[PDB]
Amino acid sequence: KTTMDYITPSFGKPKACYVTLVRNKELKGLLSSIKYVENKINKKFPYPWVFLNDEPFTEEFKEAVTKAVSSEVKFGILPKEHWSYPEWINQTKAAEIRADAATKYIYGGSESYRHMCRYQSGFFWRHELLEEYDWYWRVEPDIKLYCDINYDVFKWMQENEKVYGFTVSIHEYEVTIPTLWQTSMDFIKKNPEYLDENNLMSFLSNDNGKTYNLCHFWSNFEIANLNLWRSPAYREYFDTLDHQGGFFYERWGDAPVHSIAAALFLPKDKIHYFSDIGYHHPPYDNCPLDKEVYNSNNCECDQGNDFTFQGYSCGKEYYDAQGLVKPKNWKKFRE
Amino acid sequence: TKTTMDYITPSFKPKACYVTLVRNKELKGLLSSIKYVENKINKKFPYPWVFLNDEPFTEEFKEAVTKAVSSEVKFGILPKEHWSYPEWINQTKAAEIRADAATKYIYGGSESYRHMCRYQSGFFWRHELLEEYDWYWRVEPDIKLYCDINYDVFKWMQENEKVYGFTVSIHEYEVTIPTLWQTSMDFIKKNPEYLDENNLMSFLSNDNGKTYNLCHFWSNFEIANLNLWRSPAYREYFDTLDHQGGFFYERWGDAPVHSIAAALFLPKDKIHYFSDIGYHHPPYDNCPLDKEVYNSNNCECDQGNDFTFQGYSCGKEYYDAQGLVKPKNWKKFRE
Ligand SMILES: *[C@@H]1O[C@H](CO)[C@@H](O[C@H]2O[C@H](CO)[C@@H](O[C@@H]3O[C@H](CO[C@H]4O[C@H](CO[C@H]5O[C@H](CO)[C@@H](O)[C@H](O)[C@@H]5O)[C@@H](O)[C@H](O[C@H]5O[C@H](CO)[C@@H](O)[C@H](O)[C@@H]5O)[C@@H]4O)[C@@H](O)[C@H](O[C@H]4O[C@H](CO)[C@@H](O)[C@H](O)[C@@H]4O[C@H]4O[C@H](CO)[C@@H](O)[C@H](O)[C@@H]4O)[C@@H]3O)[C@H](O)[C@H]2NC(C)=O)[C@H](O)[C@H]1NC(C)=O
Ligand SMILES: *[C@@H]1O[C@H](CO)[C@@H](O[C@H]2O[C@H](CO)[C@@H](O)[C@H](O)[C@H]2NC(C)=O)[C@H](O)[C@H]1NC(C)=O
Numbered sequence: 134k135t136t137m138d139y140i141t142p143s144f145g146k147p148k149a150c151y152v153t154l155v156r157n158k159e160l161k162g163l164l165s166s167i168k169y170v171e172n173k174i175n176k177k178f179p180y181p182w183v184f185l186n187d188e189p190f191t192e193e194f195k196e197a198v199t200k201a202v203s204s205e206v207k208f209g210i211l212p213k214e215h216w217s218y219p220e221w222i223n224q225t226k227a228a229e230i231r232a233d234a235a236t237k238y239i240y241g242g243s244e245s246y247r248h249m250c251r252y253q254s255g256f257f258w259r260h261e262l263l264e265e266y267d268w269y270w271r272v273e274p275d276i277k278l279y280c281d282i283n284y285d286v287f288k289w290m291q292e293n294e295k296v297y298g299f300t301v302s303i304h305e306y307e308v309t310i311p312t313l314w315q316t317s318m319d320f321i322k323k324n325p326e327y328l329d330e331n332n333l334m335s336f337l338s339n340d341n342g343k344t345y346n347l348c349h350f351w352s353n354f355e356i357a358n359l360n361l362w363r364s365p366a367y368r369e370y371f372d373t374l375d376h377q378g379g380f381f382y383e384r385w386g387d388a389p390v391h392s393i394a395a396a397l398f399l400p401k402d403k404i405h406y407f408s409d410i411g412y413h414h415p416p417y418d419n420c421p422l423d424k425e426v427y428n429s430n431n432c433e434c435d436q437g438n439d440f441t442f443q444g445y446s447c448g449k450e451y452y453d454a455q456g457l458v459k460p461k462n463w464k465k466f467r468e
Numbered sequence: 469t470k471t472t473m474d475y476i477t478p479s480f481k482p483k484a485c486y487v488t489l490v491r492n493k494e495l496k497g498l499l500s501s502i503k504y505v506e507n508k509i510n511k512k513f514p515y516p517w518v519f520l521n522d523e524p525f526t527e528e529f530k531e532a533v534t535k536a537v538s539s540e541v542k543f544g545i546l547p548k549e550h551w552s553y554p555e556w557i558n559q560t561k562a563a564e565i566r567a568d569a570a571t572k573y574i575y576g577g578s579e580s581y582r583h584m585c586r587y588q589s590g591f592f593w594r595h596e597l598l599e600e601y602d603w604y605w606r607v608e609p610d611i612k613l614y615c616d617i618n619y620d621v622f623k624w625m626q627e628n629e630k631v632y633g634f635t636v637s638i639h640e641y642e643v644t645i646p647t648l649w650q651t652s653m654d655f656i657k658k659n660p661e662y663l664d665e666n667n668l669m670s671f672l673s674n675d676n677g678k679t680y681n682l683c684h685f686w687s688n689f690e691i692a693n694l695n696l697w698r699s700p701a702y703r704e705y706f707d708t709l710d711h712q713g714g715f716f717y718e719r720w721g722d723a724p725v726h727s728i729a730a731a732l733f734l735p736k737d738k739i740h741y742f743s744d745i746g747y748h749h750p751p752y753d754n755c756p757l758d759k760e761v762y763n764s765n766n767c768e769c770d771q772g773n774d775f776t777f778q779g780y781s782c783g784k785e786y787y788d789a790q791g792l793v794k795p796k797n798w799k800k801f802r803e
């Protein structure tokens with residue numbers, strides 16, 4: 134029973150939800166995101182919205198969010214076990230790494246940020262509020278949906294048998310994940326059955342797996358099948374990363390973690406790029422380059438700032454790996 | 469002889485303007501920024517707005533922009549000598565540098581980006597349209613002004629004799645400026661008279677100038693006195709950088725360039741941090757931390773996402789160098 138075997142069953146309305154991990158003090162930026170989701174798709178195809186916080190939500194936060202969302206909303210606090218140091222982690226060591234990296238890279242000195250990355254990597258998908266669902270669409274605060282979305286995306290994913298959907302890709306700052314690749318490759322050598330014969334390795338590596346090109350999918354935007362994270366393959370991959378310690382001794386983000394897994398554990402035709410969904414998560418945009426799609430969906434983004442084909446993005450690498458025909462003027466973005 | 473400050477004191481309604489370098493394809497983001505500036509300050513304290521482009525602006529662009537700005541607007545094209553490779557730059561060497569750095573750092577492979585950095589560093593303050601002014605306020609597309617601004621800021625700079633005003637500070641990616649610091653220190657070594665005896669070196673260095681801590685002020689937001697860039701010290705400095713080659717052989721940004729000059733050539737009390745102006749330039753915010761200021765000006769940002777005192781920001785370094793007392797809750801931003 135392979136990884137896909139755990140996913141194909143979920144292939145009449147799909148069981149799905151939007152999911153948001155957020156802080157009380159980010160209310161204004163969250164309300165702005167909700168307004169975008171509501172006007173661009175949620176009024177048309179309603180799905181419940183799950184809100185998660187490592188601390189309890191204030192009544193002010195809940196009242197404002199409940200009022201702003203038109204479909205059903207659910208608020209949850211996450212378990213102490215999913216947001217706290219594991220017994221095998223040396224906290225004094227973790228504290229020194231933080232202090233030393235405070236000014237070295239973004240969130241380098243942040244204690245809470247690392248707990249968040251670990252949370253998004255191995256726990257959000259098994260929070261009690263997501264168990265009844267098969268699909269989720271992650272939404273962060275201060276986001277923009279630049280265009281109308283006129284079809285149910287979960288329905289679409291379900292009918293087309295897609296597992297992982299994304300919009301923005303990029304090269305990770307390596308100082309942030311020094312030993313992530315080595316750790317992941319050792320896992321695969323130990324568990325060859327988990328490496329799909331038709332995987333997307335070429336997106337992650339230019340040398341047949343020897344080294345990592347640092348490419349990954351942005352995690353702030355994800356529309357995916359929860360059964361992937363719930364598979365033995367992913368569960369065992371996360372546990373290996375957890376025990377190695379990178380989430381705390383380095384600054385492993387959930388994005389490169391979700392990406393390496395999706396790209397290695399699945400037949401590559403299970404991964405999908407929503408070239409049609411206009412989106413912004415500071416500081417980058419995914420703006421539809423197809424004029425018909427851009428105009429029919431009343432996109433509000435400047436096509437000229439689409440990040441997809443810019444050098445530091447991994448859109449080119451993704452297109453070549455999938456054998457997708459890149460848009461006519463894709464090279465302009467490398468100027 | 470005549471010092472750097474001798475060139476500025478005379479300018480102490482002031483002759484001022486907003487100034488925007490921008491592309492035709494960034495129209496929607498530009499109009500967005502304009503609406504913010506209009507609503508938060510320009511309709512109350514009108515000042516002329518200058519727009520610049522290395523290419524001619526389209527009629528669609530000028531029409532939309534002319535209508536959106538309530539004060540007088542001026543459109544200008546850049547002299548080609550302020551946006552092209554100087555005769556001493558080896559273009560093949562530069563092309564190779566770009567091709568290699570394409571996927572290494574943001575804008576690594578971009579040719580236009582480097583000309584933009586050189587433009588903001590040594591020429592925007594020489595454009596014909598800025599000749600009649602003593603002050604400028606730089607504004608970029610996709611910006612937000614979170615709060616109302618209830619005083620004329622140029623007037624305030626003049627009356628308070630300030631030269632350089634900013635909102636966000638951050639650590640530069642060293643990979644883009646490997647030899648910038650060394651080039652700058654040699655300049656000072658040969659021109660000790662341009663080093664103000666009461667400067668802000670401590671913001672840039674933790675070891676009395678031996679090395680650069682990489683701190684700089686974000687140039688997308690600047691309210692400054694043009695006469696600073698017009699002074700002999702800055703002209704000579706820019707010329708030194710221009711001949712060293714870094715704008716094209718590395719990826720020198722104008723922000724670090726403007727910052728090293730301001731922090732070394734001026735008495736430190738001439739640099740000013742606008743703790744009261746709410747601002748966002750993807751992906752960081754400057755959000756008024758003072759309650760009365762935040763409320764009185766109806767700020768729209770989440771105080772909890774203020775970047776100022778985050779580790780990777782240089783607000784801490786800035787306050788300590790100026791001797792400004794940091795707000796009580798500054799450490800929370802380091803969690
Ligand atoms: C959990 O993680 C913990 C954190 O890593 C870890 O703690 C210990 O880790 C190792 C294990 O032994 C220790 O490493 C030794 O460090 C000695 C130097 O100690 C001093 O310097 C430390 C580093 O300072 C740097 O980093 C700081 C923060 O990052 C920074 O602030 C500072 O500016 C600087 O950049 C520093 O951390 C120490 O602080 C502690 O002590 C202070 C003074 O008492 C105190 O004020 C402070 O509060 C802390 O409590 C120290 O200041 C090295 O000298 C030593 O190296 C020698 O020994 C090794 C052993 O193999 C040799 O390989 C090496 O070559 C050296 O040997 C030469 O010298 C000996 C001397 O005779 C000679 O015999 C030999 O021939 C050689 O010539 C070694 O590197 C580390 O100090 C510990 N850290 C702390 C904070 O406790 C725990 O082990 C982890 N727990 C578990 C269960 O694994
Ligand atoms: C301008 O840059 C080019 C591109 O790097 C230089 O080309 C040479 O670079 C190496 C010499 O240092 C060698 O690989 C070759 O001599 C040559 N490379 C090729 C084939 O392009 C060139 O020397 C530079 N010219 C100047 C102005 O010094």
Ligand SMILES: Nc1nc2c(ncn2[C@@H]2O[C@H](COP(=O)(O)OP(=O)(O)O)[C@@H](O)[C@H]2O)c(=O)[nH]1
Pocket residue numbers: 153154155156159185186187188245246249272273274353
């Ligand atoms: N509850 C909670 N959510 C957090 C915390 N840190 C980050 N988040 C959320 O996790 C997501 C990613 O955080 P963000 O700060 O946007 O990280 P970035 O995208 O890397 O800049 C956002 O939805 C945040 O609101 C935290 O400490 N607690």
Ligand SMILES: Nc1nc2c(ncn2[C@@H]2O[C@H](COP(=O)(O)OP(=O)(O)O)[C@@H](O)[C@H]2O)c(=O)[nH]1
Pocket residue numbers: 488489490491494520521522523580581584607608609688
């Ligand atoms: N006219 C013109 N403006 C440019 C060009 N590249 C950047 N700019 C402007 O320079 C400023 C900084 O550019 P931006 O792309 O936002 O750079 P970033 O802030 O580093 O992400 C903005 O005002 C842009 O509109 C260019 O090629 N031509």
Ligand SMILES: [Cl-]
Pocket residue numbers: 216217218
């Ligand atoms: Cl803990």
Ligand SMILES: [Cl-]
Pocket residue numbers: 235238239240241242243778779780781
């Ligand atoms: Cl940070």
Ligand SMILES: [Cl-]
Pocket residue numbers: 551552553
């Ligand atoms: Cl040229």
Ligand SMILES: [Cl-]
Pocket residue numbers: 443444445446570573574575576577578
């Ligand atoms: Cl880029």
Ligand SMILES: [Mn+2]
Pocket residue numbers: 273274353414
């Ligand atoms: Mn985010």
Ligand SMILES: [Mn+2]
Pocket residue numbers: 608609688749
């Ligand atoms: Mn910008």
